[PDB]
Amino acid sequence: GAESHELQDVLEETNIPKRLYKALSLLKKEFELSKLQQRLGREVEEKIKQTHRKYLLQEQLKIIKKELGLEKDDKDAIEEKFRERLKELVVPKHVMDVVDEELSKLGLLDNHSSEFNVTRNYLD
Amino acid sequence: GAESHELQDVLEETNIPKRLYKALSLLKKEFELSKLQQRLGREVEEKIKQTHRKYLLQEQLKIIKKELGLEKDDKDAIEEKFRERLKELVVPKHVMDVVDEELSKLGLLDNHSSEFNVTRNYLD
Amino acid sequence: HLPLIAITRNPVFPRFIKIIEVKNKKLVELLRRKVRLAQPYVGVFLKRDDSNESDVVESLDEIFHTGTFAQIHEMQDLGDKLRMIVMGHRRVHISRQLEMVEVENVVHEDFQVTEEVKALTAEIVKTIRDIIALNPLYRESVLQMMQAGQRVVDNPIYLSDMGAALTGAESHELQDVLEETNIPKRLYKALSLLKKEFELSKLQQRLGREVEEKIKQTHRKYLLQEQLK
């Protein structure tokens, strides 16, 4: 990555050993600069890695939220809509685990299936 | 691709502009029918690809459920839940083989199938 | 002498058009007051950690002393009554926002010998190209319009600022980059932040593409089963 001026200076050298030594010195200087840059980059890497992995987990969670939201249409939020509807319900354990099985199947299934439609009506 | 009746009608036409108009006519009619066919084919292919990608996003949704809500559930599955429920009973063997066959069917039976619900109720 | 603009999670990178839409209508009166002014202007700043709307009106120290003065372009108000357009024109750092007095303390120091300084620019642009290719965020037409070899880059600092603006780094990281006064420090910090944000985003997309690979693998195994079946 030496300069054009450095290349001109290398060319100005006449003797083979002298130009070879100048090229080796330029190699050493460029390598030293690259190592300093890489070490500073690595130090900055650890510095920003001090950011807790909780941030990465939260970003994964947000991505999970930011998935087929349909511009907050509230449609296709069927699972969430039912969960909020059940939120205000002091409800037994049998219906909740049955509903868990059923909506797990719902997620497993595709939207337009007829069996999916029957399950949707039953969940209603 | 016009039918032979259209070709005979064109042949009946004598004026050169008229038969040229009819040739352009059949050309557009074929163009429209084709364009509709290719648009329909590409739409169906895109829908199938989106169905595959919806299986993809459903598996991603399963990863989402994992450790959360439904998929969180409890360690027990229907299989193991009924195994432990029946663990504390001094029980005969014919019922053990019947339960083993029922559990094998349950595993083979998809959870959504009505036969699966019948099997689950019988096992309960 | 104007009240601080409520950023409300609308970061404004240097030399980047951004839209601020604050639900509160109080800013509407301020915007309508400055219309009679021959040269309307808006203050652009950055909020500190733990954003709180009440604190924005209770205390003025929450907003970073750093700001980006700019010229207002035009009202739209298409869907909302507040569609403020904020652009990165003139970076400024107020000594004490409590006490307005302002000075254009823009530090752009550079060395007289300029033959290796632009090499890191080549590395930066190559890295930016790699990130956008592997992590598409914006159209490539901007890169074609702004080519390092075109020689039209009269503001290398602003070019680096935009390239770092592609980074998805938290506003804390952007503030850290801004605090840096030395050009090499800010450039290296921006490069490192860019590669971290690329790491995060590529993990995000790798999860789904790995789902793709898993389902294809199971289908292929079932297809061999199906041949023998």
UniProtKB/Swiss-Prot annotation, chains A, B:
Subcellular locations according to the entry:
Mitochondrion matrix
Look up the domain of life of the source.
Eukaryota
Tissue distribution is:
Duodenum, heart, lung and liver, but not thymus.
Question: Record's family?
Answer: Belongs to the peptidase S16 family.
Which function does this protein serve? ATP-dependent serine protease that mediates the selective degradation of misfolded, unassembled or oxidatively damaged polypeptides as well as certain short-lived regulatory proteins in the mitochondrial matrix. Endogenous substrates include mitochondrial steroidogenic acute regulatory (StAR) protein, DELE1, helicase Twinkle (TWNK) and the large ribosomal subunit protein MRPL32/bL32m. MRPL32/bL32m is protected from degradation by LONP1 when it is bound to a nucleic acid (RNA), but TWNK is not. May also have a chaperone function in the assembly of inner membrane protein complexes.
* Pathology linked to this chain's protein: CODAS syndrome: A rare syndrome characterized by the combination of cerebral, ocular, dental, auricular, and skeletal features. These include developmental delay, craniofacial anomalies, cataracts, ptosis, median nasal groove, delayed tooth eruption, hearing loss, short stature, delayed epiphyseal ossification, metaphyseal hip dysplasia, and vertebral coronal clefts.
What is the UniProt domain comment for this protein? The Lon N-terminal domains are crucial for the overall structure of the protein, maintaining it in a conformation allowing its proper functioning.
Self-association state and partner proteins as the record states: Homohexamer. Organized in a ring with a central cavity. The ATP-binding and proteolytic domains (AP-domain) form a hexameric chamber, while the N-terminal domain is arranged as a trimer of dimers. DNA and RNA binding is stimulated by substrate and inhibited by ATP binding. Interacts with TWNK and mitochondrial DNA polymerase subunit POLG.
Please give the name of this protein: Lon protease homolog, mitochondrial
Q: Which organism is it from?
A: Homo sapiens
